[model samples]
Target chain A: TETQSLELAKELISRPSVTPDDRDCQKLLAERLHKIGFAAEELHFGDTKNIWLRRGTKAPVVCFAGHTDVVPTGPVEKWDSPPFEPAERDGRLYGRGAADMKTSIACFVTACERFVAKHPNHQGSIALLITSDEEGDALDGTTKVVDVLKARDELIDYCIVGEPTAVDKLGDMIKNGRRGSLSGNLTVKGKQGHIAYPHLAINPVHTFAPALLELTQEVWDEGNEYFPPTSFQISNINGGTGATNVIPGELNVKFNFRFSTESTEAGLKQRVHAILDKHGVQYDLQWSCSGQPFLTQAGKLTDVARAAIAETCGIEAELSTTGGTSDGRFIKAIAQELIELGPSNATIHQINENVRLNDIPKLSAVYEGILARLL
Target chain B: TETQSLELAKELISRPSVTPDDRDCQKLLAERLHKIGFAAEELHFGDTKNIWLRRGTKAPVVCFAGHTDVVPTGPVEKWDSPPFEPAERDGRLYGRGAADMKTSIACFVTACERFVAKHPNHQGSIALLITSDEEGDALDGTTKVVDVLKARDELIDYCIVGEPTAVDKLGDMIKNGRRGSLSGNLTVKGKQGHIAYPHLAINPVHTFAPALLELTQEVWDEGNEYFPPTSFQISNINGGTGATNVIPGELNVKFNFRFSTESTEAGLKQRVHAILDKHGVQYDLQWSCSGQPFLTQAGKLTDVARAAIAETCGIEAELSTTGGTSDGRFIKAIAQELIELGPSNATIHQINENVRLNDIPKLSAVYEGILARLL
Candidate 1:
């Protein structure tokens, strides 16, 4: 089963499926799943390709979710080996998606294969949800699939998103929840005129400086046990007409909040408005809330996954809710219990991205163990 | 003499000599000055055309300084008449440089003609200094001419810059001085990273916000009796890579100071460094001092110009040291006394820029009177 997982990972990595271009990686996974009596449904939305495979039609459905696409390989010549070739060097598999997360997808297929073969009539239901748009604009990806399933009253009792969450080792960590992401595009307004006549003209940069200082210094909220403190960051700020003699009339600022469950979207927005108003900053603000905070507490799925990792990988997996948002945010809509579990993420989304070859089989065994306990 | 000045102003205005493109405007002035027994020296530096004309070599050299160039006409179709074609409508001479200040240059030539015809060998020297680069970078214009004059020890005792200084009436206000202009190009440094992990990244915008607020609010100085308070304005600020998820590595800011004599260039630069350092902002700053604060106290030049205006235009001309810098800043190095006096500036640097047609002769008479009193 370990060798089977490695072979499938190599095959998937060989195809350069960047972002919404799946390049038939989902087709390959569906073909293997179809041999085990799993019904496959290809869901295409816009430029994204998604696949839903199920082996049973019953209650207590266990769904494994992931994406087939990978981030681009920056400067291909800088790589020691071709990123799409899946080379094995020094006990590690080197590829663009080896760490995040084609290998995890490979483990999902191989683990399902081993679990279904061992228990022909084992459980309530088993499912796999896959998307090809996770690395791009996720508008037509898992969120759309989850919407379709939600409209039809399909429910996932437990969902495991195969994201790279481990820090030091294969089973060191698993994300039980994710922080919410909210962004604001703000435009500060003023009257532009000659710098020599500052009294006649108002500089937007000067007007917004105090408000910006207050914003950068404000603390939104303190996090609870499952999450860290909410954080705010100004990603982009621009003003002026390029002429050193002309004071610009408008200032634009783009900021984001990776907030914990302690702060609500509306609360954060109102607080920001209050601060801006307090400082008398005349501005137009537009808000975009990508995902509200979602948390799955210490429950059945987390307990089973932790026990499975302990049995298979000889590590007491710690539950965490750190790092960036993922497809699990979409899966939270249908799943009663949701968590993200996979291999080490240290090398994900970096140059010369790779993963330990030995950890691939151990991750597969851990996935199979979780299936054995749940089903 | 009045008709001659009007005809010369119309000729100069019709040429469309924008910025460093003289379009033979200086050639016309040189021809007229040569008829009056003035030596013409055409000093061509880079693309700029400058003319230095002098009638005699003696003490108390009275130099009349002005520019033949004009700012570009924006959206020519929006003008009532072609910008290059001088037109008279409702007692006003209309053209791009009618008021600021081809008319002044025309007056300078006529005033010199009248002065020399009346007294060919006056008590001291009478000269005309004109440039075509005043409205542009000013690098090769009056500043370069002053450098040449300074190297050769050619002294100008009393200098007059015809820069359209009047506010309400033709001889209502004359600038006895000008504020200095200093600029700073600052780059605030930081470490760029994902906005989601702000702990790992330093946002330059956030780091510099406090310092920016302080800079805008700090009072550099209260104005002295001859000058207004020092002013600081941020003309441009930019940061970020256009990505909302990226915390930019650097923030570039361009700021300028139209400072009074109460604050020195070195003092302003030092204060800015202190503010930035107090806020602990890591930055790289480049300073440019285009001009230093210059004042011609109630001396022979100011007294003679005011009396000349009162005698010719019958207005109690008020002495002022306000508004933008001019060629007078450079002339300050060679002249013991300098002032800017000309026609009404209400329509200067605007669309359909015009001067009261009747004011042309009165301005020329006033210039002639000043030359008579000084020489």
Candidate 2:
């Protein structure tokens, strides 16, 4: 399992698979999945690369959805260990996308292999949904695969995402859900003219004052139990001509909301528009619905996963739905009990990204136990 | 008198006497004056050409100070007739400077010739102070000539400047003095940095806002008896890097003041510094004091010129000190009782600048009459 996981991590990292570009990383995973009695299909849309690999045909089919794409290595000189090397020392693995999901991918694959060997005629089926575009525009990742799945009459009653959900230690925190993520880019227009002729120039900065204050101070909603209140932040803002003599014609504002179960994507949009309109701001805005908040109550699937984690890692697990959005948010549309579990996310998308090699076996044991309990 | 004035006007106008360059215009006048029994000398200072032609030596030195130089005949197509080719209509004489003292120079010269003929042995000296560099920088024109006269102990008790002081009708308005002109270019320094990190960048515009608002709103002073209150006009302002993300390092502002006798130049400067200090505005200021307020205060020259104009042109000549800077500024600096009296200012500084051909004789007669009274 360690050799397989390490080899897979190195192979995927070598692809330089910056978001949306498969770089044949999807094919590599497809070939591995096909070798394990899984049928794989390549789904290409525009520039996004996705893969759907499934095994068997039965009820209560469980799916593992994740992305293989990685963000750029910024300036290569900034890295200590080469980004694609997948080096390890002192019980820690290092490489881009190591902790993010590659370690979990290794564990999930190994768990499925063990399940198939131990139960050749198991009651339920298993599947893996992968995409090379999730780290970028995210237009054709799990969302597109799920759309195709829905088009056919496929049902995924229970699902587990390999997002790096461990906050401190492996098996310590498992994400039973995820907070919704939304990003908006706004451009406010103002009349451009000579700054010296103040009467003839409309300064966008002055015009933006009231509206910006509203955005900074307005409250969208008060959160409910199991989730905190939805919050927002203005990530960036600008309104100035390179020449001070010219009053800028437009002001740009890029902001985002990390929301809880208290709000839907549609509700957040309405609130944003209301604020813009109340200020009489003339603007153009584009929205990115990263993922809607989803929660899987601690029922059969959650209980089963938690027991499996406890039995495997010999530690009690905590159910949480915090931090950034994940593919689990999309899997919620399939009416499944979705949760995220994996290793530490400390060095996921940075220089010398790595996961502890020793922890791989522990995580694999947890995934195998979950399969044994559910299927 | 009319024939001589018309001929002189035609000859001078034909030369296209652009400011700062006599282009032999002074040599032509000096030769002509010498031919007519006057002591003509060319006072060349730096590149400026000045003609001093006098015909007597006595106490109350009566002088005619005017520029042979003319403003450029701006785009030739704007002229109905060729600028140097004096044009005539019903009663008007048209050419560049025809109304702006080229006509004055013509009538002034003819009046001086006529006066010298009549007062061959008068009690006072009759002289002409004509400069070829007046309509431009004025650096070496009447100002330099005045410096020479001061060194020679030449006393000018009464002087008249041919600056076309009349508005609607000839002899209607006689300028007894002029408002002072001053200009300043200031650069306000600030720290340059990214707009994203606003704490790192000090915006000069933000710092200058209050100062600018105060400058625009403050009424400098009330008019004293001789002049109106001082006025400050911001002509231009600029700042910043071309990128919207950069806060400007400095602000450049160009401003001019048309001040009155009531406010001393030192006082104006101090007041400006006070405003900047009050606002804590960091700046470097450069000043150009073009002219100081000069007043005739109804002196012998003012009264005599007014009386002569009323007698010759049949108008109740007003005694007002208004309009732009002139050679009169230099003469006044020497404490001479100076006044400007010339033809109707219908088209000076514009294309098709025409004077009244019929009015030239009357104006020349008035100048001659002024000489007759002063001498």
Candidate 3:
């Protein structure tokens, strides 16, 4: 009976849910949540699969948002343990989504059943926004669910996302706000001609280099107290006409930015355009906003989650808004004050993906305390 | 009716000789030569078909070499008059090889027949070296014949290749030497890594730029007495792992060089290595020497050819070694003095491939005059 959490964790891990393809992980999760007196609804949008389970749908709704899917096992043999097969040793459970974060879902479900059984007629709503497609091409996953919830005007005042945000120790760090993310793809044009007569043709690589170097070193707004300074990474750069002898006709550059609220998307776009214009380059550009920087501002909900973790785990929590985008962005879109909280994330995407079994129950107790406090 | 030459030309052009595949064109020529008091030999190597027809066993064999094959009627629909049909209109004969150079072969054959009739027992040997593979690989045509002749210790004091050499007038430019042609496929190596971490990954586009700039501006040689300086043209270049995030490990460069007599193959290769070594780039170089620069300095055969061209046309032809390589480059090794004489090379591979019909007789007379002086 006590091992049901571990068993359910094993069942979720075996689904091979990579990104928007649930492979039935959401259905299995919905069935389990339904058995615990929660109204489960499987939401399928395009290729993304998700499910929501809720009980006592009333004000002061507290939602648990997470994903059943995991990043790929990635070259499998590199793993000290099979990514899909649950392995346990020295009080650690290992699998692909073990820490990132099927374990947290199992822990939440464990904490929810105990808390809800004690207070079935609780004062507030308790919901789980579980999607199987959080890892990539996020077009269909929680984003759509958020769209649906926004369309229906559903309410979620406080949303706790089960992301493995702890750095060194359990409950040591709580992500109150996340850094905003933006990506860009650029193509610099040049006249395609014989390399021997380079004067007649332009090499886009030469034209784009200075601009790229500038972007790499440019300083945007210094991050305020809520987040770190904005940063940019050149993800890719390329050009050439398959034939090495021919001077390239176009050079491609793709980059991503992780920014604080101190810098808006418009400011970065304007900066990039200025650099390209200064270089006098002919180019085509496209941009995608993963999410705009949002800060929780250490309000009551953030304080409550912080106090629960710090009091129970005896570790001072740190507030942060720095990382790749998360589903919290989707919940944040719903006007829900969101915070990312969970256990160690070190082994989430790598082989030998494991979690401290000790943290699972301790984290579960902390989630239960949050439920108790919210209820 | 003086239709023997026309009928024979029709028979030769009717064969769909796509490059090295002569089909029965060589056989038809060989049978005719055999019937006219000449020994005919079919030299077939690989897929190329060639015929060596000679009338006398005496020294000073005046060989008239030609090809029956024609380049493909590209896209066929572009032809105004059918490329394979021997059509005549407004004093111009039209066909794929009419100007380059089935008509010349007909004139040479006609002149050979009439010359023999006038001097039944000629003082020197007269031969026809016809091949089907000249427009194709060229390996089994004149080059193979030269090899065969070299094996038998046979030598030609002089030769006249019926190539379309005139730029505007029928007897304008006589190619005494030609620029060397060579193809090189070069691959430059670079360390592949994340593009953002430029320090961790080497961008070949960056690494190869300076050397490529130097190469693009490098002067290989100064022209000698018989030829112009070498010219380089890059044909193709490519690099990238196809993933925008990853730096490419290899970059390829393909180039061709039209070199002159002032530089040999060794010297050309040495210069390429010099650039690579100077740049200190890790690269893999592959070279394909299609043909080396060759020049037939004014000597007995060249003098005889020049006198004949001037005597027939009233103006001494300008000698040049520009443009591209020809089959003469291969034949020149066997015949020390070789000249390519034909009508104006206005248009051949393009649509409306035609030649002045009346000019054929003057060319025949000029070839005949060279025989009179040399043979």
Candidate 4:
């Protein structure tokens, strides 16, 4: 019943913390969490700031994970107001981090404020896992922090990541899993010659065609229960000398795959090689796999989150594994249950990003409801 | 043997007559032809200088067709002697126009001189069709002159083009005809969109793949006795925005065909549309046919030229239709019979181009022998 979360949201949005730079955001949250009997431990590694805040030295830790960083504001002139200066118009707070979400962080802190005021000594532990490296290369983000915790034998029983999960309403959509990401770069080799002398030239574009068509039409996997079918897309294809009369010696193609758990990285790689080889193409290839699929099926975490949404926002949360990746993939390794839950994500990474002022207090209430039911 | 042809060759080579800029080389030939009782008709079109010189006005018109123009010198430092100096070193005239084909023009002039000196009242007409635009665009060259000759009803009964037709020794090879040349510029259209969203985009590179593969592997025709089988080559292919994450809207492909008489320009054009249509690729194609295939075959003209080569150079001249195109394609339209006869072409169109000094007089003798048989 408090709008203290809105004031905190405005405060965080003004910081301009643009990935791998916390700009003392975690420190500001630390001050508020400290007053409510929460102990803060700063986990710093490779130019990144991470926070591990816990309220009790007990079992069954239910942690809330999210990032402090927001994507860069593209073409600042296109914005109606300065992206770092949070502006409120028509009951919506507009800023780069308003939805992506510094507001979610504010909601987490305010939710703890209400939960601690009522119950000074909860049943089990309540913790917050926050990082400031989610939007960039992510080499030193939550994944690294999770490694440190695993080494020390401290595991999270459940996690609720504030990743702007809702599509149109506050408690409409929640991510229970994520698909794997992989990229491939292919170079097909041929002999360059004049267009008048076809016998002398081996056109690399022609040599690569049948193989490329085959790859485009290949069915990688039929996805399992939680994930959609694996997808392959050709990103770029380039060949030839700029002159219209010289045959090119090489063709460069770049492609990507968003795969499901039903398909392994090794299996996809093998299939591509087999298809290209079958077409008798001479190519040099390089590949990179970013993340493997991870899922938290219907269990205790899902039940608790669903009940909390019904009590707070009064809508059933639809579980999903679609969309691009998130920080949840990393925390899923340490937490047996991980679900992304937050405000509507329509304007999360877009220009003139904003959040519904009405959803913030209710989102905070949803977080407080999770704490009340689980702890 | 006389060195008169060598002197003329040296004089012509000194002018630096590169392509359409003849620098008064044709005027110099006109002055010399005027002294020999030949009437000159200066037919100028566009930027090219063309002249039709005739001696006797009777029916059997034997024409010596050649260009005063030569290709560029490439790199000046690559030559042992300056390209325009006409340096004679180790029994070779080293210059850009030595082999292709100032030497042949000089031989034609001197051959006419000796033939006219003996037969002042020759039975038929002797003419020379000289142009200064052959090595450049053939647009304003002999083809233009042929257009005028046809309008004026001055048909050449027999034509001997002084292109560099010999491969090794003097009069070793002669060209009776050549393959037709055609080129195509293709733009394969597709819908462009982000790589992450392939369903919303049509990749032009993928759409063009199968058709390109079929085009490359297709056999247009088999070689006959006069010409080799038709050949196709893709000179250039470019697709994609430079960014590796974008699917480009269009794929541009420029290809060329050097086709035999077995394959007409219309036939090849039809076949291409059929293949691309069969593959269901959306494309915008453009076709340009430069010249149609023409064959003189083993006729009276070939017989006369072969006998002259054997009589003057003591060698059995091989009848060939191979190599790059010549002015003979244009002259073949009006001339009843045409053949390309000249000095060895080993160094033509190359850096430090030179002709054998010893072969110049023999080449003149061969041309004179052709005049003797025809007139």
Candidate 5:
């Protein structure tokens, strides 16, 4: 019975769906969803293929969201088995997207199959939101479907995004929210001249040093329970003429902020401006905010996820709001409650990616338990 | 009488002696020096033309140093006349190498001829050291010549380097000393990872920012009378993969120190290491000292030059230890007294390189006066 989920995961991984290309995985998923009385419609936007499969047109919609596309296998020769082979080795299934998400997708599909077979007439509606652009730019992915749902006034009440959020062991950690991502491209201006005649020239590196020091040590906010403290990282910094005797006229610095809800984007921008002005550095800055911080908080969906994992895995799961951005950011726009739960993330997006064969069935049991508790 | 210096300058400039290519300019100088009872020998080293001419071989040797090479004529069409074609317009001799050192070379040669004719057997020793690579790498220039002279135990007592040292008027600023030049190549080490997961990676830019700020603002030393304050300029700085999402693993900083006599090369290195260690940064550093600071502290050569410039140009010369490095650094190793004097530097390395026609004859008189006082 557990082999059903492993079989489906192998079939999906064997296709090699590397970002913005479903490789017929969605076609296969659509066929299975159709067997459960779900109507599947393709939402093709840009280069991404998405499927909005719903079983019942009713209120209080509960959905399973996941991406069929996977990140590229970084150097296939480095793997123990071929990345696309999906070999079962020593109680672990090894593949490129095996742990990161293909296994989670299979668990969700099998869970729905068993749940629908037991309760043909469950409460409310059970739907699946799937896309093939999650590992890419994400513009044509779940965000586009979210846009369509918002236009039609069809908002989801609950969503469980199958992103690999667990760490340490199966059902150990679940993401309740995510931090905001903001970036800045800054160019500090100065006068260029020979090093010996420094008074006639302004060294941009010298001018920018103090301001960058302040920004590096500046505390944005001490986050509340849902998120950790906001962090700033200087990703890139450069100022040079390639000659050791000439002072550069300009310095470029690229930085990013993984900010908490405690600090607004505007507040961060204002503080940066104040620091630069105080240091008397003339600079041009361009800022772009990718996502706003969102939290599901302690609610019905989070309570159901915690209870489901506890009953299935026999352990109390820890709720966290860390890691990189996901499709959950887009789903949060229309869903009243949203959380991410999946397999361990330790091996995701890395070479020789694999997952425990036993964890697949356990993940399926958790998802079916959640459906039973809610639907 | 004025045409003797100006005509020889026109003849040398017309030969187009750019950088390492002497274009037989040294042959013309060697022929003229031969006529003045001086034995001339060509010291050709790696495409550079150097002539060592001497007369009256005895103690208390006095030498005159100049370069025949000129910088490249940048954008020849930008000039009013052809760069190699010497043109006299409005009491100014316009040509490449005219203001840089060609005029000074002609003045030194004529001054030597007149002095040798007046005092054929009066001096202990009189020598002329001319090179054709001063406008280029300088490795094959006077530095190599000094290396050869040092090997042969040939030392100079009082040497005058004909570099363009004047700023406003003909003899307003004379270089009595030069600041030591030292450079640093530093690499700050850190762990590299994604900006979102900053806890896993140590950003080198962040670690080095505070140290760099302190290095920029710290006062190394207050310069003595002849020298200005010890200056430190960050010539180049680079860190990162150029990606906005990656925290760089290392930061490279190239900085230069135009240090005075108050600071030693070892002292500067010790202070820089102290600052980096105080900030608890992991760094690898390499240092190179190009030239040590040297002074001709109001002795025989400098006193004679001051009185000579006062009588010839009617303006009191200001003793300085500022500006870029020159051949004086190489000459200082073998010469007991070394100083730099020449035409105004405002138009030396620029388009339409020119010199005041009146200053050419006046500079000859000043050089002749120095020879009369010393020899």
Candidate 6:
């Protein structure tokens, strides 16, 4: 069973599927899924390829979600081996998506095949949700698929997203939730003139400085039990005509907020407006909310996954709601409960990405055990 | 006499002498001065042309200083007449350097010829200092000439700079002093990292905001009888990786100070350093002082210039110490008394730059009268 998962991972990794370009990786998965009684539906939006596979039609559906695409190979020569060529060296599988998360997808298929071979008539339903546009803009990937599923009433009872969440070893950690992401582009207005005549002209940089300080020092909230405090960061700030003697007419600032469940996007924007107003800064602001914060509390899904991880890897898994946003934010629309779990992420997006070969089968066993306990 | 001055003005305006490129305008002035019993010495430094002409080897030397170079003709097609082809219409002379000191240079030569013809054995000396590098960097222009004059102990008792100072009409205003100019380039250092993980990095924009606000609000000094209060202006500020997810490592700010005589360059720099230190900002700063404040009190030179303008143009000229710096700042090193006076400046440094045709000869008469009153 471990060799089957390793061989499937090697085949998928060799395709070099870099975002929005699946390179037939989903088709290969569909072929294997079709032989096991699962019906495959290809849903493509824009240039993204997505596959929805389900075996049974019943209540309490359990879905496995993952992405087929991987991030780009930064500098090809910097890698120990070609990123697309899966290499086995020192008990580890090295490839572009080895750790995050072609191996997990391979394990998902192997686990489903093994579980079905033993109990062909298991209770409830089993499904797989895969997309090829997760690492890029993500506009036409899982979000579109979730929208279609919601419109058709194809609801999911529980979902497991195969994202690299472990820290030191496989199954040691899981992300039950992710913080929301909100960004803003702000432009402050002023009058431009010669630097020698400050009385006749207003400098936007000086006008925005006090407001920027206030924004940075403002505490939006103290996090609740499930999440940390919201964070604000100014990523870019610019103002000037490039001449050292002309005061610019506008100052532009780009900032982001990795907010928690403690605050809403509207509330944060309102507070920023108030601060700018209080400082008498004339500005035009634009906001974009990429994701709303979501949290999955302790429930049956968390209990079963914790037990399965302990039984397979003999490690007590720590439930976390930290890190950046993921596709699970979109999956929350159809699934009542969702958690992200997979192998260690130490080398997920670096020059040399790899995962321990032994952890591949253990993760598959953990997934099978969760299915057994839930069904 | 007025026709001679007008023809000389037309001749100087016909040459396209744009900063540091005199186009033989100084040689033309030297020819006229040599025929009037004045010894002409040509001083060439780098790419600049300068001429020092004196009539006597005696004390109480009165010098007429001016520049022949003109600013660029921006978008020449926008002008009604070619900038270098002097045009006369509606009692106005139209050209690129018509109102911005070219006419003043022509008037200087005419005034000197008239003054030497009448006062062949005057009580004091008469001199003219001219350069062709004022409209640009000004490094190798009047400043360099002043250095050479100071080294040789060639001092002038009274100096008149031919800058367009009249705000409304001829003899309406004269600049007895000018505000000092100092500029600074500052860089605030910080650590760069992903916007999602702000705890692992430092944002230079946020760290320097409070300090920037403090610097903008600081009051360096109060105005006295001769000058306005010291002013500070931020001309440019920038920090970014252009990526909305990466916090930049450094913030750059370019600022200038148009300070009064109440504040020294060293004192202003010390106060800025203290403010940055108080805010605990880590920064690197570079400073450049282009000019320092110098005032000419109401004495023999000012009295003579005021009475001369009153007698020549029938208007009481008001003394001022405002506006931007000029060649007068450099002449302070060689002369005890300096005043900038010329025709109306209503159309200087603008499209269709022109001067009232009638004001050209009056400015020459004013210059010649000042020499008669003092020398």
Choose 1 or 4, whichever is better by TM-score: 1
Q: After superposition, how far is residue B230 of candidate 1 from its true place, in Å?
A: 1.5
Give the Å shift of residue A129 in candidate 5.
Answer: 2.0
TM-score of chain A of 4: 0.97
TM-scores, all models, native as reference = 0.97, 0.59, 0.74, 0.84, 0.97, 0.95
Give every prediction's interface RMSD. Answer: 0.9, 9.2, 5.5, 2.2, 0.7, 1.1
lDDT of 2 by residue, B1-375 (tens): 358898888787888778777867667766777765668867888877887888767777777888878887778987788998887777788888788877788787788778777766767676889888876777878888889888988878888888888887889998888878777787887788544334556667666656766675678889877776776655445565554345678877766677888888998888888888898999999998888878888667777887888898888998776556677888876646888888876567777888877788888999989988888
lDDT of 4 by residue, B220-333 (tens): 998888888898877777777776556789988888888889999999999999999999999999999878888898988899989988888899999887766888899999
The 10-residue segment of model 1 chain B with minimum total lDDT is: B28-37
* lDDT tens digits by residue: candidate 1, B86-127: 999999999999999889988888888888789877898888
Identify the leading candidate in terms of DockQ: 5
Each prediction's fraction of true contacts recovered: 0.90, 0.00, 0.23, 0.62, 0.93, 0.84
Q: Give one digit per residue, the lDDT tens place, for model 3 in B1-375.
A: 245566566666666677867767767666766766889887888888778888878788788877877888887777787788877799877777877777778767877776777777778888878888777668778788878988897777677788788887777788887877777888888888654344666766556656676676678888887877787766555676566445677777777788887778888888888987897878889898878788789888778877987898777888877666677787778876777787776766567787877677777777778888876
Candidate 5: TM-score?
A: 0.97
Per-model CA lDDT versus the true structure = 0.91, 0.76, 0.77, 0.88, 0.90, 0.90
TM-score of chain B of 5: 0.96
Clashes of each: 0, 6, 14, 0, 0, 0
Instruction: Give the 10-residue window scoring lowest on summed lDDT in candidate 2 chain A.
Output: A236-245
The DockQ-derived docking category for candidate 2 is: incorrect
What interface RMSD does candidate 5 have? 0.7
lDDT of 5 by residue, B1-375 (tens): 467999998998898888888898888888878887788978989889898988877878888898888888988899999999999998899999898888888999999878877887775788889998987888788888899999999999999988889997888988998999999999999999978888899999999989999999999998988889999999998999988889999999999999999999999999999999999999999998888988889988888999999999999999999988888888999999999999898887889889999899999999999999998
Comparing 3 and 6 on TM-score, the stronger one:
6
Q: Is the docking of candidate 3 incorrect, acceptable, medium or high quality?
A: incorrect
Q: How close is chain A of candidate 6 to the true chain A, as a TM-score?
A: 0.97
